[PDB]
Amino acid sequence: APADRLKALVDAAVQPVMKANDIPGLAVAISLKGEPHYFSYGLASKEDGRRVTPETLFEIGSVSKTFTATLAGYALTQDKMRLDDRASQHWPALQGSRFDGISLLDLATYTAGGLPLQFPDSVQKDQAQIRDYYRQWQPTYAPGSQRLYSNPSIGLFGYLAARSLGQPFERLMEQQVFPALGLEQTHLDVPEAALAQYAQGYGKDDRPLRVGPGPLDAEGYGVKTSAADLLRFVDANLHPERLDRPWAQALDATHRGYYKVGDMTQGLGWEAYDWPISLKRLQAGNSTPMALQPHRIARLPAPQALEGQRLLNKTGSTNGFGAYVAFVPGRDLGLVILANRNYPNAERVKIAYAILSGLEQ
Numbered sequence: 001a002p003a004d005r006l007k008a009l010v011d012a013a014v015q016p017v018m019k020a021n022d023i024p025g026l027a028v029a030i031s032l033k034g035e036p037h038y039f040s041y042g043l044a045s046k047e048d049g050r051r052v053t054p055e056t057l058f059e060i061g062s063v064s065k066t067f068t069a070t071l072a073g074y075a076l077t078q079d080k081m082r083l084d085d086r087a088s089q090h091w092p093a094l095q096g097s098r099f100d101g102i103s104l105l106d107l108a109t110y111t112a113g114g115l116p117l118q119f120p121d122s123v124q125k126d127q128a129q130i131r132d133y134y135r136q137w138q139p140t141y142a143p144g145s146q147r148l149y150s151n152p153s154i155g156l157f158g159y160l161a162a163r164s165l166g167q168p169f170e171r172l173m174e175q176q177v178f179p180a181l182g183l184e185q186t187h188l189d190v191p192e193a194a195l196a197q198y199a200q201g202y203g204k205d206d207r208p209l210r211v212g213p214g215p216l217d218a219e220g221y222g223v224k225t226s227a228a229d230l231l232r233f234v235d236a237n238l239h240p241e242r243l244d245r246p247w248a249q250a251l252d253a254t255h256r257g258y259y260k261v262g263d264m265t266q267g268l269g270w271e272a273y274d275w276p277i278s279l280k281r282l283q284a285g286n287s288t289p290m291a292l293q294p295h296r297i298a299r300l301p302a303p304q305a306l307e308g309q310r311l312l313n314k315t316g317s318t319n320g321f322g323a324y325v326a327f328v329p330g331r332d333l334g335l336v337i338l339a340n341r342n343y344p345n346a347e348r349v350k351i352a353y354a355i356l357s358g359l360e361q
């Protein structure tokens with residue numbers, strides 16, 4: 001009955017949302033009572049008929065930021081950087097720029113002062129262009145005052161964390177972070193040998209969309225991973241103590257809230273909500289206006305442990321993919337919803353919520 005109920009629950013949560021959002025393929029992984037549960041739906045590729053499996057690689061887009069945050073957490077807990085470091089401390093190119101007055105924390109938590117959602121399309125995946133972009137960037141408002149969800153913000157945070165560790169971000173992820181997290185199906189650059197696992201992404205008119213190179217793509221949205229691996233990462237988050245101490249600490253560093261915007265407490269990468277909270281509030285927290293509009297932050301007097309009765313989540317999308325990860329530290333409950341369509345965050349949260357609610361009920 002338990003496996004049946006869980007399947008019934010996940011199917012009931014997933015299938016209508018897949019149909020409603022014409023999601024070709026969707027992988028759910030749920031960590032429940034110390035066990036992974038995988039539910040795979042539809043097609044990794046509509047064209048070659050490859051089914052989604054728990055090993056299908058999906059672009060997780062901005063969910064990558066939680067990996068980025070973990071690397072940063074590593075840098076932080078390795079004392080290679082501090083959250084209150086000015087950004088320019090970790091990149092000479094930024095000295096003299098406004099990043100002299102912007103903390104790593106600001107970058108991490110999108111409060112640098114209006115760094116946009118994405119790099120402008122003019123900024124290519126080019127060290128110099130990224131350098132030039134930040135050098136010329138000016139805060140729209142005081143750093144530390146407004147959250148404007150931003151790839152270049154946390155991208156730079158990750159980039160600087162990498163710099164603080166003296167290695168390229170991508171190399172640190174591949175050589176240290178992913179192996180530390182026991183992730184062998186998690187890639188910034190999917191190996192050729194794993195490309196068969198790489199789901200097709202689908203956008204408008206089902207145009208195939210796999211994420212192309214972009215500035216700080218690795219940091220912002222670089223990860224392709226399987227539901228199984230992303231759940232392993234969720235499990236690492238649920239149980240940092242299961243990782244070697246440096247990485248346990250790194251993960252812990254992503255479970256610290258720095259401010260609140262509405263119901264959301266912003267950690268490094270992870271965004272936390274009190275749990276339970278209504279689906280609508282969780283959706284609002286993961287809504288377009290939340291992402292696209294600056295929100296005055298309510299800074300916490302001290303970093304808040306993002307644990308216990310909290311839902312930590314991250315939405316992530318690429319043009320062709322829509323990922324959502326949510327976990328409830330205090331419930332040893334985690335779920336991953338990876339889809340090869342960028343379907344509305346609200347819908348991802350709806351699936352997650354239906355699953356979480358059904359697990360409660």
Ligand SMILES: *C(=O)[C@@H]1[C@H](NS(=O)(=O)O)CCN1C(=O)N[C@H]1CCCN(CCN)CC1
Binds near residue numbers: 211214221
């Ligand atoms: C993360 O996925 C962010 C944003 N996250 S959010 O849903 O939580 O608001 C959603 C879109 N987004 C993101 O990173 N977009 C990338 C997608 C990749 C393609 N585009 C160029 C690819 N080189 C960059 C924008």
Ligand SMILES: [Cl-]
Binds near residue numbers: 117
């Ligand atoms: Cl970007």
